[PDB]
Amino acid sequence: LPMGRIVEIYGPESSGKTTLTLQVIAAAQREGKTCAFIDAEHALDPIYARKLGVDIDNLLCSQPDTGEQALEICDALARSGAVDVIVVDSVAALTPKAEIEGEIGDSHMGLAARMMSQAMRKLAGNLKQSNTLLIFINQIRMKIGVMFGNPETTTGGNALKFYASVRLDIRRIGAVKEGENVVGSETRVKVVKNKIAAPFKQAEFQILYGEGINFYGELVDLG
Amino acid sequence: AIDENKQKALAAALGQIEKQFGKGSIMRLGEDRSMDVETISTGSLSLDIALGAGGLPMGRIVEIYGPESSGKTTLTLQVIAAAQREGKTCAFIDAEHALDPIYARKLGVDIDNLLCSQPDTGEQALEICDALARSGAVDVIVVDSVAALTPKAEIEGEIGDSHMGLAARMMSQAMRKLAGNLKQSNTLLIFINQIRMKIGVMFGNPETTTGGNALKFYASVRLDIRRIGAVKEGENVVGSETRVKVVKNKIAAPFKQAEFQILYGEGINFYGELVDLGVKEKLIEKAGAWYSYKGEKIGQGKANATAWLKDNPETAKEIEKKVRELLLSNPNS
DNA sequence: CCCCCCCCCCCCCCAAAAAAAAAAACC
Numbered sequence A: 001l002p003m004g005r006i007v008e009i010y011g012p013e014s015s016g017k018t019t020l021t022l023q024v025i026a027a028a029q030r031e032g033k034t035c036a037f038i039d040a041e042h043a044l045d046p047i048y049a050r051k052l053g054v055d056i057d058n059l060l061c062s063q064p065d066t067g068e069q070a071l072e073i074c075d076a077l078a079r080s081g082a083v084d085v086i087v088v089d090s091v092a093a094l095t096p097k098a099e100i101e102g103e104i105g106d107s108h109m110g111l112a113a114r115m116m117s118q119a120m121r122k123l124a125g126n127l128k129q130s131n132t133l134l135i136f137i138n139q140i141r142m143k144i145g146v147m148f149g150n151p152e153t154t155t156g157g158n159a160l161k162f163y164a165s166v167r168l169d170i171r172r173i174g175a176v177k178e179g180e181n182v183v184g185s186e187t188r189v190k191v192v193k194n195k196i197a198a199p200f201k202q203a204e205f206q207i208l209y210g211e212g213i214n215f216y217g218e219l220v221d222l223g
Numbered sequence B: 001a002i003d004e005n006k007q008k009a010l011a012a013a014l015g016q017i018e019k020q021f022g023k024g025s026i027m028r029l030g031e032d033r034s035m036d037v038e039t040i041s042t043g044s045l046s047l048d049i050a051l052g053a054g055g056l057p058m059g060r061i062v063e064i065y066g067p068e069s070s071g072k073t074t075l076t077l078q079v080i081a082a083a084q085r086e087g088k089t090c091a092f093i094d095a096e097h098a099l100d101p102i103y104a105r106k107l108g109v110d111i112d113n114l115l116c117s118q119p120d121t122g123e124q125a126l127e128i129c130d131a132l133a134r135s136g137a138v139d140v141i142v143v144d145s146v147a148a149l150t151p152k153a154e155i156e157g158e159i160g161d162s163h164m165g166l167a168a169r170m171m172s173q174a175m176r177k178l179a180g181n182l183k184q185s186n187t188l189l190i191f192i193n194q195i196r197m198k199i200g201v202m203f204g205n206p207e208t209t210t211g212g213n214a215l216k217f218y219a220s221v222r223l224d225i226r227r228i229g230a231v232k233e234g235e236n237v238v239g240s241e242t243r244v245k246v247v248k249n250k251i252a253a254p255f256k257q258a259e260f261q262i263l264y265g266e267g268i269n270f271y272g273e274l275v276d277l278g279v280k281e282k283l284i285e286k287a288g289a290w291y292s293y294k295g296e297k298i299g300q301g302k303a304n305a306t307a308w309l310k311d312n313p314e315t316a317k318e319i320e321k322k323v324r325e326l327l328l329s330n331p332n333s
Numbered sequence C: 001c002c003c004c005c006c007c008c009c010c011c012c013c014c015a016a017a018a019a020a021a022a023a024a025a026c027c
């Protein structure tokens, strides 16, 4: 993944999006880089992070109250020059302040799409100067009515597609069984956008529960 | 040389973030006690083992779905009953308009301390959840059927009127608003869901839940509950043989399952579970259809063995003690 | 030496969001 750029990882539920970003962080911490996790979903387990090989005691974490606060912390850490990797767990959970203060049922037309459009403009330059990698996790939603293309969308509007240097679609394609006990997931990652090399290549690997990505399984298949 | 300049730039930024947003706005994960996972009993011991962490996680969203009369309301009331015995405050949002208070009392709910609401719209239901979550005074909230969370436009409208993705949009908005409030207050929110059929679909299972795709992502646990048979006292059907599959889990490993009995007017058979786990862990010897504890013939048939454990509280304390100490994979404190 | 007098004119949009639901025997 390229430094000083934006990356998007999206897919369906329990496809391995958080597991993947923690293995990126882990690998980066082993090369003496500082990392941060903005956990907008409010759903990170520190014990599981430790099992995938993350140094918990040096990982900066924030559970921000609004989407604006989450993206202001990203810009603050980008300008510092001190943080190398930032993960924002789910664009979907970046709630505008007006929507938080408002009632359930209240309309806020394109307010999240606007926030994300504004955030990208501000961040793209700050990340390049600092040589900081920002990773956005996204959830899938369904487009309905008269559809031009596939009905799978991502959340938070159309800015992030343009600004992203890499976009990864991750999917769970089956189970890994020790006879009867389901012990992990067979995973597929498609490269749907790439600006630093040719796109549409794919990767197949196993995520084993409590260990992470099975390195030796990949080495067999590549051998 | 650069190490020091980076550590000063970091310290300064951490200072500026904490000034701008508040004290615990950012910190190291290893020294954030807020983000430790705390759990509550489900009222079932086989389900507490299947969940890996010994129960349902506080500050998170849980989904329980399944077919008609599978035990979705019974299971959620046993959760509340167990939470109330630990001196917690619970709330039931009854969107289905179908809760019997006498039956809740028989499952062991203290109904004089259970907050209940039968809301008119889905928007009112979810605004009460956000009001109780912000208060910091309610520990467990149950919302009975997502399917009955009707938007106000649909209530005001006619039958036959189309409201494209209106409920899915309300559920997307509610998840965004609630996730953070629940984590701050350390409140458990449980959604019950119904099943429907997808039609025109590929070779995947045609079974779906209601209210769109948001809740699948935001849930830390998802439980599929199913009636797999009957429990008979000779001829009289006296209860249900139940299976719970853990279909999503972010606090431990998923795809474990639990089997237990629901007995009509009692709830989940705790001693029936304690037999089956005492057997599996070599603390009870089942020679054919004769259950034995350390040579002593406790009974013949699972019902007689369960009846024996009922009238010996010391033997049941002892077997529970061991099974708990052995089988829980991720104990918290 | 002696003493001030008077206002004039606008400029530019920004952004998506979300599913719902079975129907039916054939010899």
Ligand SMILES: Nc1ncnc2c1ncn2[C@@H]1O[C@H](COP(=O)(O)OP(=O)(O)OP(O)(O)=S)[C@@H](O)[C@H]1O
Pocket (backbone or CB within 6 Å): A012, A013, A014, A015, A016, A017, A018, A019, A020, A045, A048, A185, A207, A209, A210, B216, B217, B218, B248, B249, B250, B251, B252, B253, B254
């Ligand atoms: N704490 C854990 N212990 C064991 N297995 C886990 C844990 N957390 C996640 N997993 C499993 O690892 C697989 C991938 O999980 P994640 O990395 O959380 O995926 P994800 O796409 O972030 O899913 P979400 O956020 O819940 S939609 C799933 O099958 C999980 O059940």
Ligand SMILES: Nc1ncnc2c1ncn2[C@@H]1O[C@H](COP(=O)(O)OP(=O)(O)OP(O)(O)=S)[C@@H](O)[C@H]1O
Pocket (backbone or CB within 6 Å): B067, B068, B069, B070, B071, B072, B073, B074, B075, B100, B103, B240, B262, B264, B265
């Ligand atoms: N008041 C009651 N008295 C005796 N048995 C009951 C009572 N209410 C429910 N049951 C039984 O307990 C079993 C599980 O019921 P529930 O927990 O109500 O299931 P459920 O999935 O909520 O079903 P719904 O809401 O009606 S689709 C069923 O066999 C019921 O008939």
Ligand SMILES: [Mg+2]
Pocket (backbone or CB within 6 Å): A017, A018, A089
């Ligand atoms: Mg995740």
Ligand SMILES: [Mg+2]
Pocket (backbone or CB within 6 Å): B072, B073, B074
């Ligand atoms: Mg019910």
